[PDB]
Structure 1
Amino acid sequence: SFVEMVDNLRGKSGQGYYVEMTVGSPPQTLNILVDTGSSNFAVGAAPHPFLHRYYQRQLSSTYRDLRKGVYVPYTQGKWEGELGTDLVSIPHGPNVTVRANIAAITESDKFFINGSNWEGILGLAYAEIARPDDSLEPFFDSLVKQTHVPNLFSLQLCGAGGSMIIGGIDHSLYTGSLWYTPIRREWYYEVIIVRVEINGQDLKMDCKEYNYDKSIVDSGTTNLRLPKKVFEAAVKSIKAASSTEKFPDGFWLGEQLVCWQAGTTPWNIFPVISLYLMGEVTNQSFRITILPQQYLRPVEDVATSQDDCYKFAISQSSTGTVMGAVIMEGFYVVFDRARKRIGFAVSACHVHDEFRTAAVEGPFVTLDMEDCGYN
C-alpha cells in the first residue's frame, strides 16, 4: 500500500524537501522538512516572519508538557524551545497515529527559510545525536515501537517533489538493482567511502581522507560537502576538466552563479564523479556516479534575462563528508535501519544527460576497506 505515499514530498534541494503531517487534537496541519541528518522532531510554536502557521499547543487536548527546555545547533541555523508530546499523523503516509516527542520552537536564528513552505523539521537519524540527549526518543523510533510499521524508510528526491516511503520499498520508484552499504554506526547515517574517481580518474588519496572525520547521508543538506583535502583535490580536477571555459573564483566557492544561453550549458566539459561505497561482502564495494547536472544546482536568473544559471553545489567541510540532497536526487535511497544498511538504486526520476547517465554499479573489489574508516 506504498502507492499512497508516492509523490508525498515537495520542495527542492535548495530550501529542502518536506512532507505533510498533523499534530494535536484536533489535527493541526504542518509541512515538515525531511532530514536524515538530525534526530529531533521540532515545529514552529510561536509567530515568525517566515512562518504562515505554527503549532498551537493550547488548542490541542492531547498535548503534554515535558517541563524541559531544548535547543539544537545545526551547521547553519539554530532554535530553542520547550519539549512535550502529542499525537502525530502523516496524511500521505502509513495510516497510523503515534505519540511522539515534539520540540515546540519558541525562538530561532537562521533556521526557518523564507518561502520554503515548511514550518517544522523531522529528524530521521538516531537517538545518539538527539538533543538534549539520547533519552529523547526520535519520531521514527516512536513510530516503530507504537505500530507495526517496518523499521525502514526510503527516499526518492526529485530535483529538476519526491517520495518518502515509510515502512518499505516501492519497487516502482527505481530501476536496476539496489546496492547496499553498511551503516557504520547508528547516530548519523554514517557510511564509508572507499574510493573516489573523477571522469574515471582515481583521486589517489588515502581513503581515510574521504571519511575524515566521517561520511553521512543527509537529506537535510543541500550540497555534496567534502573534507578540505578532498574538496581541493576534487575542485582541481573539475577545473582542469572544464578548463575550456573560465569561471569566477567565487563560483568554485559556491558564491557566484555562472550562466549560459538558455539551453547551451556545456555539460560535456564537466566531469562525472564516482563515489565508491563499502559493500555487504568481504572486499566488495559498489559505486554511484554523479553527473554535472547534480552538482550544478540551477538558480533563478539574477539578471532580467532568462539564461540557465547554476551554483557549484560542492563545498568544503570541516565536519567530514556529507552526501546531501543534490547527491540523493538522482537516486532511490533506502534507509534500512532493521538491517543496518543503506541502499542505492538509480531513481525513476533520474537526470537526463545526452551521452551520460547517473548510475549505481557493482560489484567491485576493494581490499582493506576497513582502513578507510576514520578513528
Structure 2
Amino acid sequence: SFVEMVDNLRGKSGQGYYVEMTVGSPPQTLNILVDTGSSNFAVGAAPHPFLHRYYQRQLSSTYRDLRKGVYVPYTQGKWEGELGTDLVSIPHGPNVTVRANIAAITESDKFFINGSNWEGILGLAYAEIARPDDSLEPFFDSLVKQTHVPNLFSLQLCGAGGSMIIGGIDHSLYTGSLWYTPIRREWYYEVIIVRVEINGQDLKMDCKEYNYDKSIVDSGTTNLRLPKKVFEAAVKSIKAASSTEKFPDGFWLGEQLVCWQAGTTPWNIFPVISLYLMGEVTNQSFRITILPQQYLRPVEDVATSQDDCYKFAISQSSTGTVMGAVIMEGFYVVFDRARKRIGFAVSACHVHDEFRTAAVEGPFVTLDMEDCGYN
C-alpha cells in the first residue's frame, strides 16, 4: 500500500531530504524539507535569490488568513512569516487532502540554501515546540485528525534520496529486527543515550553527560552533534585511532575537508561509533553502530579533480545531542507516535565495506538507565 510512497524523498544529507507537496487551489507544487526537529510547516511565500518557485496565496481559492505573525529560530537559520490555513496534499503519499496551518515565509536569514531545490519545511515533531505556541496544531497532527492515517511514520534516508512512509512501516526497506527506544517527552523526539563506545571501548562518562540538556532525533540536521565534554572525548578517541595519518585541525572542526586518491580512502583507520539507546524493558538497551562511511560526509573537490574528499560530520553543540542525517542514513527509523517510541533497524540502502557493517544489536543490560536523563 506503501509502494507508492517508497522512494519519495530526494536530496542529500548535506542539504536535507525533501518530499513533494501541493498547497492551494488550484494545487501549487513545492518541494518541502522533512524535519523531525521542528513542528512548523512553512513555505517561501515571496521571491528570494535561492528559491525557484513559491507559495502564492493570491492564487488559492482555499487560502484563509489567520491574521497572526509568526517567527521561528533554528540552531542555524530563522524566518518570519504570517499564519493561515489551506488544503495540502502529498502526491507520492497517502491519497488524502487536509486543511493545515501554513506559515507564509516573508522574511528569512540563513534558512534557504542556494540551489537546495526545496522551498519549504515540514515540522514533524510535537505541538509543544511549535510557534507561536503549542496551540498551533502541527501538520501531522492535522493529518491524523482529519483522516484515517495511523499516527505513525518512518524515514529511510540514503547516502551516495530516500523514502518517507506515512502511516506505517514498509518491511521491505529494512533487514533484521526493529529495536524500539522510548520517547522521553513528546516535544522533540527526545531519546536517552545510556552508553557510548569507540571501536568497542567505552567512552566512560556519566551517561548524564551524553544527554546533557537533551538528545533528539532530527532529520533536519546534517551532522552528529554532541555536547561539549562528549565531543572532546569522541574527537580525542577518533584522532588516536586514525593517528596513522594527519589532517588539519580545521578538519576536526568540520571547516576544511580532506581528500584522497580515488578509491584509496583509508576507511579501516577510522573507528566505528556505537550509541546505546534505552530499551522498552527494564534494564535493557540496544546499540546502533555507525561506520566512518557515515560520519565522513562526501563533498566535491576544492580543486575540482578526480579525488575523494570528505568533511568530518561530527560537530559539538550546546543544546544537547542531535542525531542528524549521518546517523539516520544507515538505518530505517520508525517514529511510532501512537506508542510513544522510536524504532531502529538496519536499512536496506546501507553503507558498508567488505569488512565492517552498520548494525542494530540487542538486548543489552544497563543498570539505572533512568539516571541518564538530565534534569
Output the TM-score relative to the length of structure 2.
Answer: 1.00
Determine the C-alpha separation between the residues in 1 that align with 2:258 and 2:45. Answer: 39
Which deviations, in whole Å up to 9, do the C-alpha atoms of 1:127-170 show, x marking residues without a partner?
A: 00000110000000000000000001000000111000000000
Determine the C-alpha separation between the residues in 2 that align with 1:187 and 1:194. Answer: 20
Determine the C-alpha separation between the residues in 1 that align with 2:341 and 2:149. Answer: 18
SS across alignment from 1:371: coil
Which deviations, in whole Å up to 9, do the C-alpha atoms of 1:57-98 show, x marking residues without a partner?
A: 010000000000001010100000100000000000000000
SS across alignment from 1:143: helix
Determine the C-alpha separation between the residues in 1 that align with 2:198 and 2:352. Answer: 19
Which deviations, in whole Å up to 9, do the C-alpha atoms of 1:214-240 show, x marking residues without a partner?
A: 000000000000000000000000000
Unpaired runs of at least 5, structure 1: none
Determine the C-alpha separation between the residues in 1 that align with 2:272 and 2:161. Answer: 24
Alpha-carbon shift at residue 320 of structure 1 (Å): 0.1
Unpaired runs of at least 5, structure 2: none
Determine the C-alpha separation between the residues in 1 that align with 2:137 and 2:302. Answer: 44
**Structure 1 residue runs of 4 or more that deviate by more than 6 Å after TM superposition:** none
Alpha-carbon shift at residue 14 of structure 1 (Å): 0.4
Number of aligned residue pairs: 375
Which deviations, in whole Å up to 9, do the C-alpha atoms of 1:105-134 show, x marking residues without a partner?
A: 001001000111000000000000000110
Determine the C-alpha separation between the residues in 2 that align with 1:24 and 1:63. Answer: 6
Which deviations, in whole Å up to 9, do the C-alpha atoms of 1:255-297 show, x marking residues without a partner?
A: 0100000000000000000000000000000000000000000
Determine the C-alpha separation between the residues in 1 that align with 2:215 and 2:352. Answer: 27
Determine the C-alpha separation between the residues in 1 that align with 2:348 and 2:153. Answer: 17
SS across alignment from 1:251: coil
Which residue of structure 1 aligns with residue 273 of structure 2?
A: 273
Determine the C-alpha separation between the residues in 1 that align with 2:79 and 2:291. Answer: 35
Alpha-carbon shift at residue 352 of structure 1 (Å): 1.7
Determine the C-alpha separation between the residues in 1 that align with 2:230 and 2:65. Answer: 46
SS across alignment from 1:67: strand
SS across alignment from 2:176: strand
Alpha-carbon shift at residue 305 of structure 1 (Å): 1.4
Determine the C-alpha separation between the residues in 1 that align with 2:160 and 2:351. Answer: 8
Which deviations, in whole Å up to 9, do the C-alpha atoms of 1:234-261 show, x marking residues without a partner?
A: 0000000000001101000000100000
Determine the C-alpha separation between the residues in 1 that align with 2:115 and 2:360. Answer: 34
Determine the C-alpha separation between the residues in 2 that align with 1:22 and 1:296. Answer: 35
Determine the C-alpha separation between the residues in 1 that align with 2:215 and 2:243. Answer: 29
Alpha-carbon shift at residue 354 of structure 1 (Å): 2.1
Alpha-carbon shift at residue 55 of structure 1 (Å): 0.2
Alpha-carbon shift at residue 304 of structure 1 (Å): 3.4
Determine the C-alpha separation between the residues in 2 that align with 1:233 and 1:160. Answer: 29
Identical columns (%)? 100
SS across alignment from 1:370: coil
Determine the C-alpha separation between the residues in 2 that align with 1:109 and 1:304. Answer: 29
SS across alignment from 2:232: helix
Determine the C-alpha separation between the residues in 2 that align with 1:27 and 1:270. Answer: 48
Determine the C-alpha separation between the residues in 1 that align with 2:52 and 2:286. Answer: 44
Which residue of structure 1 aligns with residue 121 of structure 2?
A: 121
Determine the C-alpha separation between the residues in 2 that align with 1:201 and 1:195. Answer: 11
Alpha-carbon shift at residue 353 of structure 1 (Å): 1.4
Determine the C-alpha separation between the residues in 2 that align with 1:186 and 1:327. Answer: 21
Indicate the RMSD between aligned Cα atoms, in angstroms.
0.4
Alpha-carbon shift at residue 99 of structure 1 (Å): 0.1
SS across alignment from 1:176: coil
Which residue of structure 2 aligns with residue 370 of structure 1?
A: 370
Which residue of structure 1 aligns with residue 45 of structure 2?
A: 45
